[PDB]
Amino acid sequence: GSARDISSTNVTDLTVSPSKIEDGGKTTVKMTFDDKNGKIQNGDMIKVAWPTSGTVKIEGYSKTVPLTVKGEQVGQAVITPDGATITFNDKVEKLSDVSGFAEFEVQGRNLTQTNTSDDKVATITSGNKSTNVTVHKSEAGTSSVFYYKTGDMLPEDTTHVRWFLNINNEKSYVSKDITIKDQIQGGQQLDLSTLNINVTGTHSNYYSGQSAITDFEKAFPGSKITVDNTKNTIDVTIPQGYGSYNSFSINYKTKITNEQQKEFVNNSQAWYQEHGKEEVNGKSFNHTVHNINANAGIEGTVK
Amino acid sequence: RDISSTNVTDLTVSPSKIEDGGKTTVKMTFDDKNGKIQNGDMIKVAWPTSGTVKIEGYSKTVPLTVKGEQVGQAVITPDGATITFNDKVEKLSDVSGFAEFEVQGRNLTQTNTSDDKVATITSGNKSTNVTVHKSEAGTSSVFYYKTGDMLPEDTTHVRWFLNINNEKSYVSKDITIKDQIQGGQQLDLSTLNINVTGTHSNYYSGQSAITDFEKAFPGSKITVDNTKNTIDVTIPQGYGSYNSFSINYKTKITNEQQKEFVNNSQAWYQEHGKEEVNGKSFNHTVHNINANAGIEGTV
């Protein structure tokens, strides 16, 4: 099973949709190829490369889109946060005038450890063609947010959606008990084995795996995490005697049951009071996470 | 060192009676007869900053210069005017200077009909009276009107507003407007913002403001030529109905000595029931601000 890196001979164009993105932003990368300069054989590979280390990091979302024509898998697009590689099968050695593409979403990251508004460029390469992408890191805002909800999708895991219940982020004294109800919407399924609590401050500790819930409830006398599996409901109550001077980060991954669903929602309510600031009673903190778009088309003529 | 009380000779206000939004030249004069002016000496001219009558000082910085020597500095702020003297003034013996600047007269009285409230401007120990007039709202249901202004905090750029379909009524023809920005000023594309209110409620500002408006409202197009200073806005009748479009931009002044700034427009609209309008001239003019400061001394 021998292979060839035919990217330098067969790549036609390399398109990147948004040439200017923000830090952590998504980017549509399109690679076009044809056999007008060399016939595509079994083992042939098109390799798409990008900066993987330093101040500019480019992380492609892990997806697998097969190049299929008339029910025959002639190739396959393999996407990895460190590089994309397209491998063709022996089922293509019977087609002529072959021309196709590999379109996928890639996360752009700015890692310049310097103050003030910053712009940094990243050059994605595929064969002869190379494209420049700008990633912007805006100046950091003032840290003054008590409770908020955030969902994440890792380039190393596109099957699960990360959810974060960040409580008392500024280590502030909490005047009331912190109660948060959570309703996970359709298209996904809650995984209990992933549920982890990351307390940071006076009573700092990381609780994860099996005993994760009970370890938190025992260590913080009064605290309660309640999970409904089928309904996808997580109700968490933390006492004020432990909520003060501590940042509670509740993280859980939800297994995607529908890849065709374009975005994922999770609704949450909050009950808290930061000492000095005003109290919150049942305010809705809802967050939406976008899925990943990826395609790989191929045209060919038989006989 | 505040020396306003012991040096101000006369405080003067030009137009005594003005309308709500009018401008007023305020002259201040100081002497050296009642004591020497030194380094760190301050002359303050104060006016009502909040209430029924608000006075807004147009932001300017005019230096007190005598024969190639800047002995003082006069700064105007929408809250007060401070005149600071440098160490270079401690060479002159007989000093007599002035500082005249324009301020905005505002009548914030929220009461029924015509209202006249006096605003008293103070400088040291001298006082003056300014009458501001509110003139009651009308029944003028203008479809398309153009009006610009200059903010007392920003005197370097000129605001211009393109208010389309203000009474958000049914429209029978695609609304088209042409904008011709005149000389002495330059278009700033960053300040160009769109504000939609009515059936559709949106506000697009900065950078991609034009693109975001064109994407969200299919059919609508804003043609901006930067070097020639020409804006052409075309909105389809399907979106132009029941929506008030507010297109505002700032125009950077490239001529501080210019007397007034002009801006022309041509409207193309058919408001259902009323008359058809084809290429009618909707022109507006913004008045410029004049600020002066002069010092007179002898060795």
Binding site: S143 | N193, S205, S246
Partner: peptide
Amino acid sequence: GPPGPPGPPGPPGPRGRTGPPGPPGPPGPP
């Protein structure tokens, strides 16, 4: 042994784009 906790939440976003210019004033008389 066991791997570490997930990283600390990133620096909060920028600042909201300045509000729209206010509503137009009352119409004038004669």
